[PDB]
């Protein structure tokens, strides 16, 4: 059929030119039913038409069409556990979005797509319904009602084919979980393929690190319940006999470094195969070959196994590639942070040869700051150079400010409140400013802190701190005295070894002391400082302004920060008053902790703690009685009341503030007092020595599935505190508090774990050696912040 003209009926958005173009047929050509059907199918495929009809009028080829209504909006109702924006992202990724049209036959398809998304996020009983609201001018809104349903949780994790290790002992090291008590924080009970693969890898490692080279995971099975609210996992394996490590043999283009390696491949012939050690050998060889320039030194380990004698023989293949050089290093995504903040963390220098280990180190160092959510790397090449490359670190910034509140409880500090506002990257500079405050039964503290972590390129820091501290003693199991102090402090920090850290600084502190109970160990200092107060009254004030030089050293080698198993921590602190200050005194403290394991799985441990301290004055003066040392409690010696170990107070005969019988008073003249007066309320001492020997074991009655999250210990604590300036000749009848032989011992049990309320630590101790005046407190605990 000849066509002398073309006409359309229904073209609203698509222009007439676009239609005339997409059509195979044009004006002035012969046409048949086949070409008409082709045109109709093309119009249908344009995705903008719903119903098409190409008929023949008297002379003209008339094209009727009902354009698919243009989508004006996409609403949602019932997306509780799914963000509207993420759902819209998934949708517009599927193809449907605003501006386009609505295919009136793909409703159920989109419904099933969203249902599949819900099946992927955990929910399997979800029901999606797409309602369609027409609107004039051929527009349409698409509403999506979601019935989410109930999530599915794991009810069981089983392992079959295991005979040497119980399934619980293996699940204990998984990220998935089947039991989640209300008194522990061990994880959720949800299912994800990524976690499953991670757990399979963990199991394979647990087995390869014991001699089971022929370990094989036959298959895995995931199953549901007919109600689709429970999930079941099953893992079949085949653990083969244990294998030894007979020898090692290297071969490849070692680059003449065959001497520096055979010392890395030395073993005790007849050892137990292990995968961690093999990977460590490989990483060491790679680090060496990087030290010698090579950037991608491939290393492969192939084991040749012999079942007759059960001997493994490793075969290491080394391919040291070519040397690559770095021309640039770029950072994209740092709209707030400056380039120096990201560059001073790079261990790979620009303008030098390449090392991928150093690039990974830089990535990890950038991850630790906390200023970036994601950190990705890309080592691009250089157009027209086979030995040059440009490194690129892509980053996504994160908010740094932090409002914070916190609550806690404990026997020592009663109820403890904390509150602070922090900022870690002030205007993209690295500075960390903050305002913090703490409040407990016997002290308030408020500090304003600032610090630059790089005052020098090497990593040296320079801090800064203003502080206000109010301290009531009667609330701390001591003699009565209120100290209100305010001051400032600055300090530098020097890192030298990645574990050792020195620090040195200056400080000023003003102290005001009031509401002081007459006692001998206080006048001994007052007199020294020129004062001459009265004994028959406690309206006594004393102000001092002191400048101090503070020094310190820290050593940290613990394998872990939470529940360590091997290593040692050590801290030395010291302070000395420099001339000009009213007070002249020096003070020193040394804390030490040492964890030693006695097994291979690190479940039986021997912990040893010590705390030494000594201070004294210089110009015939004494040390302030508000800088003294205190022992007793859940940190130094357990089984005793906090801050009771040591010297006690020897009061004077003195009227009281406001007398009211039925209240216990400490040797007031209004009660028949005419001479000095022993007491049981502690004051502290200038010298202190404390020790603790603890034995950490596994929790015996709690399931092995999550008994690795609870720590059980049996401890023996010892302690003594004493004053060196007590003249036992003048005050005869009362004991000698300058004797360190008065050692206080205790022994008992302790538990420690993590709870939603916060960390928990319980302790029951029974002091068998204690002296007159020491108050016992067997049960102790602390629900910390």
């Amino acid at each position: 059929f000849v066509v002398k003209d073309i006409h359309f009926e229904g073209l609203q958005r698509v222009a007439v030119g676009a239609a005339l173009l997409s059509m195979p047929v044009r004006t002035g050509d012969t046409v048949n039913d086949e070409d008409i059907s082709n045109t109709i199918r093309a119009l249908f495929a344009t995705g903008n038409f719903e119903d098409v009809r190409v008929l023949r009028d008297g002379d003209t080829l008339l094209v009727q069409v009902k354009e698919r209504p243009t989508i004006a909006s996409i609403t949602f109702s019932g997306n509780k556990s799914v963000k509207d924006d993420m759902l819209k992202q998934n949708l517009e990724a599927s193809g449907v979005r605003v501006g386009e049209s609505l295919d009136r036959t793909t409703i159920a398809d989109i419904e099933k797509g969203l249902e599949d998304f819900y099946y992927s996020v955990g929910k399997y009983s979800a029901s999606v319904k797409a309602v369609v609201t027409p609107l004039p001018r051929n527009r349409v809104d698409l509403k999506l009602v979601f019935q989410e349903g109930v999530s599915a949780e794991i009810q069981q994790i089983n392992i079959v084919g295991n005979h040497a290790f119980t399934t619980d002992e293996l699940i204990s090291h998984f990220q998935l979980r089947d039991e989640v008590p209300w008194w522990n924080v061990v994880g959720d009970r949800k299912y994800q393929k990524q976690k499953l693969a991670g757990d399979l890898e963990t199991l394979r490692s647990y087995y390869l690190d014991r001699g089971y080279a022929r370990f094989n995971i036959d298959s895995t099975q995931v199953s549901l319940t007919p109600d689709k609210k429970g999930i079941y996992v099953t893992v079949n394996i085949t653990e083969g006999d244990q294998y030894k490590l007979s020898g090692v043999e290297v071969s490849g283009n070692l680059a003449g470094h065959s001497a520096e390696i055979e010392q890395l491949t030395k073993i005790e012939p007849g050892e137990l195969y292990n995968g961690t050690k093999v990977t460590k050998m490989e990483d060491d060889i790679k680090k060496l070959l990087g030290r010698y320039g090579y950037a991608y030194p491939r290393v492969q380990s192939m084991p040749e196994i012999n079942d007759a004698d059960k001997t493994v023989k490793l075969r290491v293949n080394v391919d040291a590639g070519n040397r690559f050089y770095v021309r640039k290093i770029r950072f994209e995504g740092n709209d707030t942070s400056k380039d120096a903040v990201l560059r001073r963390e790079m261990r790979q220098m620009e303008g030098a040869w390449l090392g991928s280990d150093l690039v990974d180190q830089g990535k990890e160092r950038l991850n630790r700051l906390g200023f970036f959510e994601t950190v990705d790397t890309d080592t691009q090449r250089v157009p027209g150079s086979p030995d040059q490359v440009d490194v690129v670190y892509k980053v996504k910034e994160r908010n740094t400010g932090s409002f914070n509140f916190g609550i806690g409880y404990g026997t020592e500090s009663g109820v403890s409140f904390q509150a602070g506002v922090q900022q870690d990257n002030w205007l993209g500079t690295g500075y960390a400013v903050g305002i913090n405050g703490t409040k407990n039964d016997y002290q308030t503290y408020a500090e304003l802190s600032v610090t630059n972590p790089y005052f020098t390129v090497d990593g040296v820091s320079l801090g800064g701190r203003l502080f206000y501290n109010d301290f009531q003693a009667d609330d701390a199991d001591l003699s009565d005295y209120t100290n209100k102090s305010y001051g400032t402090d600055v300090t530098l920090g020097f890192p030298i070894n990645e574990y050792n850290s020195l620090r040195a600084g200056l400080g000023y502190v003003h102290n005001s002391l009031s509401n002081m109970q007459p006692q001998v160990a206080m006048w001994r200092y007052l007199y020294s400082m020129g004062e001459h107060p009265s004994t028959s009254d406690q309206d006594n004030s004393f102000k001092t302004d002191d400048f101090t030089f503070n020094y310190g050293w820290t050593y940290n080698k613990l394998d872990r920060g939470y529940f360590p198993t091997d290593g040692s921590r050590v801290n030395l602190t010291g302070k000395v008053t420099i001339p000009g200050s009213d007070n002249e005194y020096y003070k020193v403290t040394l804390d030490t902790a040492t964890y030693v394991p006695i097994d291979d799985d690190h479940k039986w441990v021997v912990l040893g703690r010590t705390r030494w301290g000594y201070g004294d004055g210089l110009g015939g003066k004494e040390m302030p009685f508000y800088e003294n040392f205190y022992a007793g409690g859940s940190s130094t010696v357990r089984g005793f009341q906090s801050n009771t170990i040591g010297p006690k107070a020897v009061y004077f005969p003195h009227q009281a503030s406001n007398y009211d019988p039925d209240y216990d008073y400490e040797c007031a003249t209004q009660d028949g007092a005419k001479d000095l007066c022993k007491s049981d309320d502690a004051v502290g001492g200038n010298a202190m020595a404390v020790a603790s020997l603890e034995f950490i074991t596994p929790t015996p009655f709690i399931s092995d599935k999550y008994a690795n999250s609870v720590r059980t210990s049996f401890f023996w604590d010892m302690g003594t505190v004493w004053d060196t300036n007590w003249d036992s000749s003048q005050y005869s009848g009362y004991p000698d508090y300058s004797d360190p032989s008065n050692i206080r011992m205790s022994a008992g049990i302790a538990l420690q774990w993590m709870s939603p309320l916060g960390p928990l630590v319980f302790s029951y101790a029974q002091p068998f050696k204690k002296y007159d005046g020491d108050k016992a407190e067997q049960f102790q605990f602390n629900i910390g912040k």
Binding site: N399, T400, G401, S402, F403, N404, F405, G758
Partner: peptide
């Protein structure tokens, strides 16, 4: 208990 609220 310890609540942090990154503003």
């Amino acid at each position: 208990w310890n609540w942090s609220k990154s503003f």
